[PDB]
Amino acid sequence: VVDPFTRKEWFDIKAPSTFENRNVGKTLVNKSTGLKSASDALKGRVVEVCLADLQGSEDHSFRKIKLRVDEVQGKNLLTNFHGMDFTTDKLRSMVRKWQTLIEANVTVKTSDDYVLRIFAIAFTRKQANQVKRHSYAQSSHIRAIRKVISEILTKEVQGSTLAQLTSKLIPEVINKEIENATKDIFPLQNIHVRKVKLLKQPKFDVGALMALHG
Amino acid sequence: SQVFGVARIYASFNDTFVHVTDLSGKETIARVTGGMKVKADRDESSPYAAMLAAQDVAAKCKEVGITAVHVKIRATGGTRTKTPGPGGQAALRALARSGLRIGRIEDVT
Amino acid sequence: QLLKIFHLKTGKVVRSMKISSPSYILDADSTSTLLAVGGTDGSIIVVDIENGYITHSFKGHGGTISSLKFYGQLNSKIWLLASGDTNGMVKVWDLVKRKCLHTLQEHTSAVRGLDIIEVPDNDEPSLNLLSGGRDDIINLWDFNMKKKCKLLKTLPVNQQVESCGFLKDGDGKRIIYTAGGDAIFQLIDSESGSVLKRTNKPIEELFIIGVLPILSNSQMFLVLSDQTLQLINVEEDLKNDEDTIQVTSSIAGNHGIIADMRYVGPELNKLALATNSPSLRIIPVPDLSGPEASLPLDVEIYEGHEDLLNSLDATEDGLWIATASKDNTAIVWRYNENSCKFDIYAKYIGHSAAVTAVGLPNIVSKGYPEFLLTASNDLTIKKWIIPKPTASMDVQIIKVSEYTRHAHEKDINALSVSPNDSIFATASYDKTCKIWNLENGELEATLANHKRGLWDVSFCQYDKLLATSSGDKTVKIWSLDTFSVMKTLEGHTNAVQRCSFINKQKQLISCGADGLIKIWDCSSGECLKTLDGHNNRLWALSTMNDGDMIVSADADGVFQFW
RNA sequence: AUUCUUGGAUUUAUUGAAGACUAACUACUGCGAAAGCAUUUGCCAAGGACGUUUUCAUUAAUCAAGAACGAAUAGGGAUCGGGUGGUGUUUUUUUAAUGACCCACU
RNA sequence: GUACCGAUUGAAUGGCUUAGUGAGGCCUCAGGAUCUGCGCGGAGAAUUUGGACAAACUUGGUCAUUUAGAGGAACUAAAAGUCGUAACAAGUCAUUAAAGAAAUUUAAU
């Protein structure tokens, strides 16, 4: 006989600035005692959540956001970005028969030394008045187009990190920048980056972490 | 307006699993599965027993204070049958009929 | 979503409240003693009289309710006197309709018992108002009918509060019982913000509590626990007669599951039992009524243990009561509640694994019942024997080094002493029962003809037969010379757990996993009678010298007699 | 029926390890004499076809023995690779121009 | 299982006791790791000659009882076991007021 939920902390989640509503949801931790209080112990839970519920608009039903938990103050816990996710169904939907699948990735260091491996997926479209049913690529275009994307990825990154970088990711300006260069070879369809991940955050830096906070 | 979590129904063969957890997912609440409420070893994934266990999970949910939830359905997957079970519908039907709130559910197969 | 209204002790439905879509948590009775109102997590309040009128719909705030208390001119829950919330707030209202008089916002922690105990005057010239149920802090509240409220002092020396109290006359100089969920209840002063004394008897969270109808410094006080009640002294500090916090009595109930039973009294009077709780309940057999009020000693439960109790055993007179637990020790308790340390004879440390079996040698007057024969899960059996002083008085070290007997590879289940002190047979899971001498520790016999590990072995009291229980749905009876099987009883539809002989040596009584209790004869090996009152698994057995009144073990605390 | 389990089985979330493979697209497509060949990237030679107003000049064709590897008649349409022509389009508010597309031929 | 005869005086205990073993503190000749102090003292651990007080530990034997008890004979349990013999029995409607959103409360005919 314990009934632990009469002992559990009730608790909420605060989100950073460059978004819409900064209240997200509810979690539960533990009663703060001496010898394992609730605060200092774990701090490492992650909340993967779609940003359509974070912004309200419905042109972003994909593109989940993973979150990383950093620093709390008395039922007020901030969070940091952790990684970009994609839906299941749409990547099961977007891969059509009789077309060409193109993917790419690179690893890079940013302004503060966050190291991220970005992904990039690329699919080919058909055109008006096309006679044949397949319209594939020529496998030497693909050696070029994978290369063309690669310098576009590096010129975007290593300047003015996630405060601006995730803000570049949301209206997918970079995907249009890919389209602006790919058009001289073979045009394309839906192209997204579909995934990002963090592996090498250097240090805590609470002071610069409070720049997104008001 | 509401307090939210995730319910995460794992609909496998020969038994179906549920565990309503917090929004982080690491903190679980009131797991109890479908095979527990029957002793025949053949109806551990039946939809009739799935309605009984999901009613009990919905009972313990509001008894804590949780009022709304989402769910991520999940078949076995990998090298396996890749298809959701019978009572995965019956688990979702019984908790929605209990009076809980549902929004924007997905698949994690 | 059920709140049913009944009249007198028939229990017939006057009116059932199921109207609101949130479920109701709590229910209480008015100071007018005819009206009622219940609390929910949606703050839906309706005042209902039972003739029936279920009055004006009050809806002015959400939030959750976890406590309620009434008043003679503001007869409603904490939605009208104050505001039980999920963040902590006080809202001042009137007996008139839904207009809000005052609001009061102080709390940074969630609290619901904001007016969990009254202030009687509601002018407070020397009076105060207490509050706390989840905030784990206590604040001294003023009452103001047309003004804002004031804080007098706070109480941070606690760590958890769940309910509060306030003195009936209202001075607060007298005793204030304060219950907290940290297994701590205290006596405090409200005029000084000082604790009188703190009492730490439980290790379990203190539950909710209502009010006694008694005056000031009370007569007796009832403290809530799990399936048991206790009465405590009312001073606990030098107020009237005594101090230095104690417990007056601890009246026991029953636990659902029973692991073992053993008759305690020398005239087969008292029964003590081993359950999942680390407590010793001595109620059932001499108490044909409900809760214990008629034991021929002081009513008290024992605790010295850290874990659950697996088994217990005592000799005939019942002065040495050996009990076994998972905390790697052995504790023996005394009948008449007098000893040197607490009530424990000694605590036997030296076990390499848990102790699930314990046993006493045969009775004479002393000596052998002063001794102890215990069995642990470290594949050895230990005989604690110190003969030159009185044994079981201090901590004994006689068998930890190399005097322990080891011939096993699987765990023991029970042990049984013979009517003489010469031999003893023990049963285990390795499909054999072994007879050993008590004097030296040499393997006297090995009995291995089985299909499953063995739970219980029983000697008969004219010691010409041997009974043992197995898992091939049979009970095996072997000779005193053990060169051949005496009888092989078959007919149980499930596995048998415990078999034992009656003190008149006429019947072998079987307790197994049938859901049923069968009595067989030891004269023809036939079925005397089957006995049916049960629907759960059986665990233990104890019979008296007479043979008619026989108690059994269940999974729901039901004890039957015949 | 076997198996595991309150030193907490299953599951949850986190991390490391391992070997294995490139899921949808993947075709009666492409390559290799067959055996065989599907992750990105780089290196290394090699091969055929197409184009050619470049070169030697019958140096050639088929096959017991022997070697290596392997268990041991002429149209119709589609499509792949190349080439050419364009009273052709599109990318082009960027000067130009790669590229794709389509018509026609081989 | 109880009472009775009995070898082994084995184990335990009691009376006596041959014999062996033997704690502890006291004084003194020496011995000195160490001390607040106008030529050094209180105080103080180890070792050590001789003398005096001295409880105590172990075994064996004699005799009694118990236990174990060869060997002997009864009583009780087992009405039991098998086999044979013998006969007997046995299937508070309506309308409509007033409070209340609505339930419900009261009134009226």
Swiss-Prot record, chain A:
Key word Acetylation present: yes
Keyword check for Transmembrane: no
GO molecular function (one): structural constituent of ribosome
GO biological process: cytoplasmic translation; maturation of SSU-rRNA from tricistronic rRNA transcript (SSU-rRNA, 5.8S rRNA, LSU-rRNA)
Post-translational modification: N-terminally acetylated by acetyltransferase NatA.
Locations listed in the record: Cytoplasm
Taxonomic superkingdom: Eukaryota
Cellular-component GO terms for this entry: 90S preribosome; cytosol; cytosolic small ribosomal subunit
Subunit structure: Component of the small ribosomal subunit (SSU). Mature yeast ribosomes consist of a small (40S) and a large (60S) subunit. The 40S small subunit contains 1 molecule of ribosomal RNA (18S rRNA) and 33 different proteins (encoded by 57 genes). The large 60S subunit contains 3 rRNA molecules (25S, 5.8S and 5S rRNA) and 46 different proteins (encoded by 81 genes). eS1 interacts directly with uS11 and eS26, which form part of the mRNA exit tunnel.
UniProt similarity note: Belongs to the eukaryotic ribosomal protein eS1 family.
Function: Component of the ribosome, a large ribonucleoprotein complex responsible for the synthesis of proteins in the cell. The small ribosomal subunit (SSU) binds messenger RNAs (mRNAs) and translates the encoded message by selecting cognate aminoacyl-transfer RNA (tRNA) molecules. The large subunit (LSU) contains the ribosomal catalytic site termed the peptidyl transferase center (PTC), which catalyzes the formation of peptide bonds, thereby polymerizing the amino acids delivered by tRNAs into a polypeptide chain.
More details: Present with 92400 molecules/cell in log phase SD medium. There are 2 genes for eS1 in yeast.
Protein's UniProt name: Small ribosomal subunit protein eS1A
Highest classification ranks of the organism: Eukaryota, Fungi, Dikarya, Ascomycota, Saccharomycotina
Curated annotation (Swiss-Prot), chain B:
Cellular compartments per GO CC: 90S preribosome; cytosol; cytosolic small ribosomal subunit; nucleolus; nucleoplasm; small-subunit processome
Keywords: Acetylation, Cytoplasm, Nucleus, Ribonucleoprotein, Ribosomal protein, Ribosome biogenesis, rRNA processing
Entry's localization field: Cytoplasm; Nucleus, Nucleolus
Any GO BP annotation: translation
Post-translational modification: N-terminally acetylated by acetyltransferase NatA.
GO MF assignments: mRNA binding; structural constituent of ribosome
Miscellaneous section: Present with 29600 molecules/cell in log phase SD medium.
Similarity field: Belongs to the universal ribosomal protein uS11 family.
Function comment: Component of the ribosome, a large ribonucleoprotein complex responsible for the synthesis of proteins in the cell. The small ribosomal subunit (SSU) binds messenger RNAs (mRNAs) and translates the encoded message by selecting cognate aminoacyl-transfer RNA (tRNA) molecules. The large subunit (LSU) contains the ribosomal catalytic site termed the peptidyl transferase center (PTC), which catalyzes the formation of peptide bonds, thereby polymerizing the amino acids delivered by tRNAs into a polypeptide chain.
Subunit structure: Component of the small ribosomal subunit (SSU). Mature yeast ribosomes consist of a small (40S) and a large (60S) subunit. The 40S small subunit contains 1 molecule of ribosomal RNA (18S rRNA) and 33 different proteins (encoded by 57 genes). The large 60S subunit contains 3 rRNA molecules (25S, 5.8S and 5S rRNA) and 46 different proteins (encoded by 81 genes). uS11 interacts with eS1 forming part of the mRNA exit tunnel. uS11 interacts with snoRNA U3. uS11 interacts with MPP10. Component of the ribosomal small subunit (SSU) processome composed of at least 40 protein subunits and snoRNA U3.
Name by which UniProt lists this protein: Small ribosomal subunit protein uS11A
Full-protein positions shown: 11 to 119 of 137
Curated annotation (Swiss-Prot), chain C:
One GO cellular component term: 90S preribosome
WD-type repeats, residues: 20-57, 60-105, 109-151, 156-198, 304-343, 350-394, 407-446, 449-490, 491-532, 534-562
Keyword GTP-binding: no
GO molecular function terms attached to this record: U3 snoRNA binding
Location(s) in or outside the cell: Nucleus, Nucleolus
One record GO biological process: maturation of SSU-rRNA from tricistronic rRNA transcript (SSU-rRNA, 5.8S rRNA, LSU-rRNA)
Top-level division of the source organism's lineage: Eukaryota
Record's keyword terms, sorted: Nucleus, Repeat, Ribonucleoprotein, Ribosome biogenesis, rRNA processing, WD repeat
Its job: Involved in nucleolar processing of pre-18S ribosomal RNA.
Subunit structure: Interacts with snoRNA U3. Interacts with MPP10. Component of the ribosomal small subunit (SSU) processome composed of at least 40 protein subunits and snoRNA U3.
Other information: Present with 8070 molecules/cell in log phase SD medium.
Official protein name in the record: U3 small nucleolar RNA-associated protein 13
Gene that this polypeptide is encoded by: UTP13
